[PDB]
Design an enzyme around this catalytic site. Structure first.
Site, mmCIF file in Angstrom:
data_model
loop_
_atom_site.group_PDB
_atom_site.id
_atom_site.type_symbol
_atom_site.label_atom_id
_atom_site.label_comp_id
_atom_site.label_asym_id
_atom_site.label_seq_id
_atom_site.Cartn_x
_atom_site.Cartn_y
_atom_site.Cartn_z
ATOM 1 C CG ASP A 72 -2.037 -0.939 1.177
ATOM 2 O OD1 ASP A 72 -2.656 -1.075 0.099
ATOM 3 O OD2 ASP A 72 -2.328 -1.569 2.214
ATOM 4 C CG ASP A 79 -12.277 -5.035 -4.230
ATOM 5 O OD1 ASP A 79 -11.331 -5.686 -3.737
ATOM 6 O OD2 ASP A 79 -12.129 -3.922 -4.789
#
Ligand code: NI
Length: 534
Positions: A248, A388
């Site tokens: 990230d 997702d």
């Protein structure tokens, strides 16, 4: 200017050229870009490299329109060394079905055709190998791996190989699925690769080096034990089991970039660590000022100086309005990231909007989605769809419009069927769209790869949702990456042996140092799987 050998790189200014230039410099060479025929002259050029990415016609139109055809032919006639990379190699052919109307340099009189996707995913994205031969060159080692990323290739048959041999061409062959194709060519002063040496780690650098120094060292004297271990057994179509490391990228209070929620050299360093520990590819999840100054672009640029494997960046790749009010379409945003060091972009939320609109238009696209614009310019292989999903049970297919499948694990009320519902905006909002419908639409639209996350398994460290993988694999013909749930090496093994996943991505487990990409590779290797070991 003369204090080191100079390498001229023909730049049509489209795509990631950071890696190639950084590789050359890293090898001790000075890079001289050639954006126009005015930027170089025959006698003053000793090393010419023709790199190319994207749609065949796009690249060849650009190239020829800028007047490089005559300069290139003359250079080749000068007898001096020239290296073509990916489209640079394809440009040596008569043309490519990818762009019917296009015409190449035609040094090789036949066109590139699309891989057969009835037996395997297309584009080919991964680490393949050159088939053992007596006529290999520039150090191409059958026991090493190179990174290929393309839908089209110079697919071979006995007749073409014979003509090539009689034409005096040396061919490095590779096989993807049951199809043999040209991985590299060499005739006199011409050399070209279908794979990206700059994206192939140390094995890649060796190839560039061998080219620049004009030498074909013999392959190492491996033991019969090593060969059996390193040879391609053509499981998984001949591609190694691709291991992806993800991290990230955040902006903390002080406005600095970090990987952890509590702390721009951190993201850079971690990516370097990953690469050094065997990651076959590094993905940056951008979750972080004018577009030109986006900090994420600097992370990529800095990482690209030493990380010679593919880089993927997801997040923020959409139509945007700059700080000065200038409307900048997704296509231009992506080009910025590509030129910065990214090789692929991940589309998330917009992918759902696109798919939804896609069905509204009756299973067709309006060519306005980021998926369509980016894939048409750079090829499907440049667009990744981050999905997702979330499991949802039902008594039977009769309970929903979305495609469902019989699951091995019944629901709260015994429901034996289910579908996966997609989410957007970081999984904060649901949509009446199944992953089956979403992936199929995005594929139709031009996406070349699916990053398959799973809300339910994310962060769990208990393994991947195996039925989900199989469900998506039944849906599309593009590579599917298993993400979410990976905690230990065994999870990667399970995915590669129990499902048709085309790659596995790990994040936290690699980030927390619990295991390294190499720990996972050693395990898989120890278990009969083929993995890149460079
Ligand atoms: Ni100099």
């Amino acid at each position: 200017g003369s204090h080191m050998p100079v390498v001229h790189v023909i730049d049509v200014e489209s795509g990631n050229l950071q890696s190639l230039t950084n590789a050359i410099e890293h090898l001790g060479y000075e890079v001289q870009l050639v954006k126009s025929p005015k930027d170089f002259n025959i006698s003053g050029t000793s090393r010419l490299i023709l790199p190319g990415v994207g749609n065949y016609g796009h690249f060849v139109d650009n190239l020829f329109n800028r007047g490089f055809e005559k300069p290139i032919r003359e250079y080749i006639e000068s007898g001096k060394p020239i290296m073509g990379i990916c489209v640079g190699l394809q440009a040596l052919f008569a043309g490519s079905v990818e762009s019917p109307k296009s015409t190449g340099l035609n040094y090789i009189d036949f066109k590139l055709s699309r891989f057969d996707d009835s037996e395997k995913p297309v584009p080919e994205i991964g680490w393949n190998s050159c088939i053992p031969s007596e006529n290999l060159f520039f150090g191409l080692d059958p026991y090493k791996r190179y990174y290929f990323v393309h839908s089209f290739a110079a697919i071979l048959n006995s007749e073409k190989k014979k003509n090539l041999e009689n034409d005096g061409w040396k061919i490095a062959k590779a096989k993807y699925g049951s199809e043999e194709f040209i991985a590299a060519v060499n005739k006199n002063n011409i050399f070209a690769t279908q794979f990206h040496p700059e994206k192939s780690g140390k094995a890649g650098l060796n190839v560039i080096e061998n080219f620049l120094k004009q030498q074909s060292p013999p392959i190492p004297n491996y033991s019969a034990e090593e060969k059996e271990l390193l040879m391609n057994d053509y499981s998984n179509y001949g591609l190694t089991r691709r291991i992806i490391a993800c991290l990230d990228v955040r902006t903390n209070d002080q406005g600095d970039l970090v990987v952890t929620k509590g702390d721009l050299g951190k993201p850079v360093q971690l990516a370097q660590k990953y690469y050094q520990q065997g990651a076959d590819e590094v993905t940056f999840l951008n979750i972080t000022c004018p577009l030109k100054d986006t900090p994420m672009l600097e992370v990529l640029k800095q990482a690209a100086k030493t990380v010679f494997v593919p880089l993927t960046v997801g997040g923020g790749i959409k139509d945007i309005v700059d700080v000065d009010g200038t409307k900048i379409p997704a296509l231009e945003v992506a080009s910025l990231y590509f030129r910065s060091g990214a090789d692929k972009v991940s589309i998330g939320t917009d992918a759902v909007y696109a798919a939804e609109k896609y069905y509204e238009l009756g299973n067709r696209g309006d060519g306005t989605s980021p998926i369509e614009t980016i894939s048409k310019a750079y090829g499907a292989q440049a667009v990744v769809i981050s999905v997702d999903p979330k499991r949802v049970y039902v008594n039977s297919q009769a309970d929903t419009k979305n495609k469902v499948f019989e699951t091995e694990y019944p629901g709260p009320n015994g429901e034996k069927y289910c579908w996966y519902q997609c989410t957007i905006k970081g999984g904060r909002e649901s949509r009446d769209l199944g992953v089956w419908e979403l992936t199929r639409a995005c594929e139709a639209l031009g996406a070349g790869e699916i990053l398959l996350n799973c809300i339910d398994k994310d962060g769990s460290n208990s393994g991947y949702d195996l039925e989900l993988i199989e469900h998506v694999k039944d849906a599309v013909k593009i590579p599917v990456i298993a993400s979410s749930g990976a905690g230990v090496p065994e999870h990667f093994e399970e995915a590669f042996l129990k499902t048709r996943a085309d790659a596995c991505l790990g994040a936290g487990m690699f980030h927390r140092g619990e295991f390294t990409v190499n720990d996972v590779k050693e395990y898989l290797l120890e278990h009969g799987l083929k993995v890149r070991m460079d």
